[PDB]
């Protein structure tokens, strides 16, 4: 009986450390498509016809 | 001669015109001071090539 409540216990404490896990990854999901938007910001502004301008 | 002289120096100045009014947006190409600018063609950084405008 102990080790049954203690491992509904455990499934519930694994279910969050994947909530946590999973919004982590969430944010870090746009902090790639940020990355990236600024990657290609980069490899435009690296062209010779950019005068300091643009 | 003096008469042929005359279109001479329009057309003279009008070479000079060129080099000194012609750009691309406002960067004058034709006077010199375009110099060397390298143009990045791909899609990971250091892969440009040099064009030069005298």
């Known amino acids: 009986?102990?080790?049954?409540?203690?491992?509904?216990?455990?499934?519930?404490?694994?279910?969050?450390?994947?909530?946590?896990?999973?919004?982590?990854?969430?944010?870090?999901?746009?902090?790639?498509?940020?990355?990236?938007?600024?990657?290609?910001?980069?490899?435009?502004?690296?062209?010779?016809?950019?005068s300091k301008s643009e | 001669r003096v008469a042929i002289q005359e279109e001479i120096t329009a057309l003279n100045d009008e070479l000079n015109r060129i080099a000194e009014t012609t750009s691309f947006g406002g960067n004058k190409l034709l006077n010199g001071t375009f110099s060397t600018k390298s143009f990045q063609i791909g899609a990971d950084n250091g892969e440009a090539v040099m064009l030069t405008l005298k």
């Open chain 1, 1 to 50: 009986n102990v080790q049954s409540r203690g491992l509904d216990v455990a499934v519930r404490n694994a279910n969050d450390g994947i909530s946590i896990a999973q919004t982590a990854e969430g944010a870090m999901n746009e902090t790639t498509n940020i990355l990236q938007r600024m990657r290609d910001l980069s490899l435009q502004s690296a062209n010779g016809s950019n």
